[PDB]
C-alpha cells in the first residue's frame, strides 16, 4: 500500500500589516517624501480618501476613547487639528509624533520617522520653519508624471526658506493656477500633484528667473539636513550637537586670535553662538537663523557638521581656518 499520510494543518504565518507596506520614496536623499504625501499615497493605494482612511484606522489608535464607527463620520480636523494643520505637520509636533508612531505600528515599517523632523525634536526650533500653505514645484510634477514616476511632495517644499527647486531652478508656486486658492496640506482628498480644491492640475513648465544664489545656501543646507537623518543610524544626542557648536565657536575664537579682521565678518555669529551655548543646551536652535549661517561662515556643509565625528570635524575646521591645532 501507500505509506504517505499527508497533514493539512495550518501553518500560522506571522501577523500581516493592516495597511500596505508602501516604501517611502527617495529616503536619505534631498527629495524624500513628506509624511503627508505618504499618507495620501497610502490612501490612494487602498482606494480610500486620506480622510476616510484616517478615521478608519489611524483615529482609533490615536483617539483612544471614542466609538470607532462614530469616528468614521467626522471631519479630519477632529483628530488632526486643522486649527494648526499647515505643512508644519511634517515637523516635530506632538500630533506628528503620535501619527508617525501609529503609522509605523500599522505597517510595521521602520523608516517613517525619517519622513519628518521628530528626530530633530529639541534640536531645531519649530517657529519660523514651515510654510502655512501647501507649495509645489510644477516642473517636478510634470517631469515625474511624464516619466511615469510616482508623484509626491518632498520635505524641502514644506519649508519657508526653500522657494526654489535646484533641479529645475523654478520658484515654488503656492497658488493653484485654476481656482486661484491656496491648498491646505491636509484635506479630505488631496492626491499629490492635484489641486485639493478644484481637482485641477498643478504641473506646468514654469520658468524661474530670480536670483537663486541668495537662497542656495539655505536650500542646500536644508536638503542636506533631510538627506542626512536616515544615514545617521541613531537618534541624535542634543549635547552632541551643542558641543559641536561649541567646538566651532572655539575654532572661530582661535581664528580671530590669529586674524583680527575676521572679527568684522564673524562678530554677530560669534555672539549668537555664545548666546546659544549659554542658554539651556536642551533648548532647540533656530535652523536657518543660527546653524546654517554658522556652518556657512565655517565653510562647512550641514552634512559635514551633523555627520562627521568630533575628530574629523575638528581637523576640517583647523584646516579651513589654517590653525595648527590637532584634537
Amino acid at each position: 500500500i501507500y505509506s504517505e499520510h499527508w497533514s493539512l494543518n495550518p501553518l500560522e504565518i506571522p501577523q500581516r500589516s493592516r495597511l500596505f507596506s508602501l516604501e517611502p520614496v527617495a529616503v536619505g536623499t534631498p527629495y524624500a517624501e513628506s509624511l503627508s504625501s505618504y499618507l495620501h499615497r497610502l490612501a490612494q493605494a487602498h482606494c480610500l480618501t486620506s480622510e476616510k482612511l484616517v478615521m478608519g484606522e489611524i483615529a482609533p489608535l490615536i483617539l483612544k476613547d471614542e466609538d470607532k464607527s462614530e469616528l468614521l463620520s467626522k471631519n479630519l480636523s477632529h483628530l488632526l487639528g486643522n486649527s494648526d494643520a499647515k505643512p508644519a505637520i511634517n515637523g516635530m509636533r506632538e500630533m506628528t509624533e503620535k501619527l508617525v508612531t501609529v503609522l509605523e505600528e500599522l505597517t510595521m515599517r521602520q523608516d517613517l520617522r525619517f519622513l519628518t523632523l521628530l528626530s530633530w525634536k529639541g534640536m531645531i526650533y519649530d517657529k519660523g520653519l514651515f510654510r502655512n500653505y501647501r507649495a509645489w514645484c510644477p516642473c517636478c510634477c510634470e517631469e515625474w508624471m511624464q516619466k511615469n514616476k510616482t508623484i509626491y511632495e518632498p520635505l524641502s517644499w514644506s519649508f519657508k526658506d526653500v522657494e526654489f527647486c535646484l533641479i529645475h531652478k523654478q520658484r515654488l508656486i503656492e497658488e493653484c493656477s485654476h481656482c486661484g486658492a491656496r491648498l491646505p496640506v491636509m484635506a479630505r482628498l488631496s492626491p499629490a500633484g492635484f489641486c485639493s480644491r478644484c481637482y485641477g492640475w498643478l504641473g506646468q513648465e514654469i520658468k524661474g528667473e530670480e536670483e537663486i544664489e541668495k537662497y542656495r545656501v539655505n536650500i542646500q543646507g536644508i536638503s542636506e539636513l533631510i538627506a542626512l537623518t536616515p544615514q545617521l543610524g541613531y537618534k541624535p544626542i542634543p549635547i552632541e550637537l551643542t558641543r559641536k557648536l561649541q567646538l566651532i565657536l572655539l575654532v572661530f575664537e582661535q581664528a580671530i586670535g590669529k586674524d583680527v579682521k575676521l572679527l568684522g565678518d564673524l562678530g554677530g555669529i560669534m555672539e549668537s553662538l555664545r548666546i546659544a551655548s549659554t542658554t539651556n543646551q536642551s533648548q532647540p536652535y533656530h535652523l536657518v537663523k543660527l546653524i546654517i549661517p554658522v556652518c556657512e561662515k565655517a565653510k562647512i556643509s550641514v552634512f559635514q557638521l551633523f555627520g562627521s565625528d568630533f575628530k574629523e570635524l575638528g581637523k576640517i575646521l583647523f584646516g579651513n581656518f589654517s590653525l595648527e591645532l590637532k584634537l
Binding site: 500500500i1 499520510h5 495550518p10 500589516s17 500596505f20 493605494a45 480610500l48 480618501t49
Partner: protein, 310 residues
C-alpha cells in the same frame, strides 16, 4: 505504518472519527497532479492560467488545501523579514442568486480574504473602485498564486460570448498585477479552457483524471487504496474490504473522495452502534443511489469525451 495508532481503541468514538477524518492518503494520480501543479506554480513560464478539471470528488479541494499549506510553509522562513507578503490566496466562487454572475461580490470577497480595511466605504480615484482596490492589493501584497475554486460558477451567464468575457475580466485583473490564477472546477471549466488566443496561450491545462476500471494498473491502484483505507480504518477488528472491490467501485466511479466519505459514513455508523467490524449491509445502508451514480457517470463521461481532444 500501515496500521492506525493502537491506543485509539480505548479513546472515545469522537477521537477515532477525528483521526479518520483528518487522515488522507496519497494515491498516484493525486501526487502526480500535485507535482505538476507545484512545478507550474514555481515556474509559470509566462502562463497566467493553470485550469484544473476533474470529476466531483477526485480531490480537487484537498489538492488545493495541500498546495496552499505547502507553499505557505515554503515561504514561511522569510515572512518574518517581509510583511504584507501573503504567500498564497485561495477563495471559492459563489453561484449567483440572480441570473448573471455578480462581479462586485467576487471583488469584495477577494478583498475580504486579503484583510482589506474599510472595504465597504472605498472610493474611486478617477464596480471600478472595487476592481482597482483588488488590483492594488494584489500588486502590493504580492501573492504567489490565486486559487479560485468552483470555477464552473463563473459561467453563470445567459450570453454565450459573455461566458469568455468572465475570463476576460479575470484576465484584465491578472495582467495589471501579474498574479497567477489557477482556477479549479468540475468538467464545466471545459467551455472556458482555450477560447480565444489569449486564453489558449497563457493557460496550462491539468486534468485530475479519475481511476477508470479499464486499465489493470488503475484497478490495482484502486484495490491498493481500498487496502490502505481498510488498514487505516480505526476499528477493533479490520474488516475485509478488498474483496468487494467491484461493489466499492460501482458506487464511487473511482473517485477517491467518494470512497473516503462513504467509508467515513460506514465507520461512524459502526462506532455509534459500538460495532467491531464492517458488514456488507453496513456499506449498503449508506451507499449512493443508483440514479445518482448514473448521473455523475454520465457527466464525467461527457467531460472525458470533451477533454479527449488530441
Amino acid at each position: 505504518s500501515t496500521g492506525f495508532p493502537l491506543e485509539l481503541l480505548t479513546r472515545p468514538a469522537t477521537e477515532r472519527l477525528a483521526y479518520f477524518e483528518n487522515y488522507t492518503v496519497a494515491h498516484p494520480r493525486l501526487k502526480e497532479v500535485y507535482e505538476i501543479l507545484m512545478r507550474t506554480i514555481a515556474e509559470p513560464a509566462g502562463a497566467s492560467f493553470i485550469f484544473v478539471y476533474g470529476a466531483s470528488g477526485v480531490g480537487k479541494t484537498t489538492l488545493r488545501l495541500r498546495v496552499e499549506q505547502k507553499l505557505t510553509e515554503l515561504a514561511l522562513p522569510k515572512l518574518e523579514s517581509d510583511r504584507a507578503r501573503v504567500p498564497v490566496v485561495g477563495i471559492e466562487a459563489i453561484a449567483p442568486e440572480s441570473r448573471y454572475f455578480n462581479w462586485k461580490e467576487y471583488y469584495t470577497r477577494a478583498l475580504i480574504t486579503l484583510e482589506e480595511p474599510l472595504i465597504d466605504h472605498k472610493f474611486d480615484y478617477g464596480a471600478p473602485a472595487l476592481r482597482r482596490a483588488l488590483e492594488n492589493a494584489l500588486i502590493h501584497r504580492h501573492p504567489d498564486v490565486f486559487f479560485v475554486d468552483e470555477a464552473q460558477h463563473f459561467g453563470k451567464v445567459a450570453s454565450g460570448y459573455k461566458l469568455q468575457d468572465q475570463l476576460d475580466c479575470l484576465k484584465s485583473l491578472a495582467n495589471m498585477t501579474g498574479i497567477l490564477h489557477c482556477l479549479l472546477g468540475t468538467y464545466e471549466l471545459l467551455t472556458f479552457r482555450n477560447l480565444s488566443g489569449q486564453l489558449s496561450r497563457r493557460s496550462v491545462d491539468i486534468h485530475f483524471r479519475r481511476y477508470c476500471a479499464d486499465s489493470p494498473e488503475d484497478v490495482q491502484a484502486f484495490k491498493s487504496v481500498l487496502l490502505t483505507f481498510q488498514q487505516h480504518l480505526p476499528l477493533a477488528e479490520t474488516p475485509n474490504l478488498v474483496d468487494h472491490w467491484e461493489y466499492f467501485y460501482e458506487r464511487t466511479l473511482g473517485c477517491i473522495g467518494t470512497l473516503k466519505d462513504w467509508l467515513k459514513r460506514v465507520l461512524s455508523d459502526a462506532l455509534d452502534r459500538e460495532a467491531t467490524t464492517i458488514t456488507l449491509k453496513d456499506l449498503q445502508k449508506r451507499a449512493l443511489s443508483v440514479a445518482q451514480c448514473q448521473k455523475m457517470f454520465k457527466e464525467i463521461q461527457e467531460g472525458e469525451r470533451q477533454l479527449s481532444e488530441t
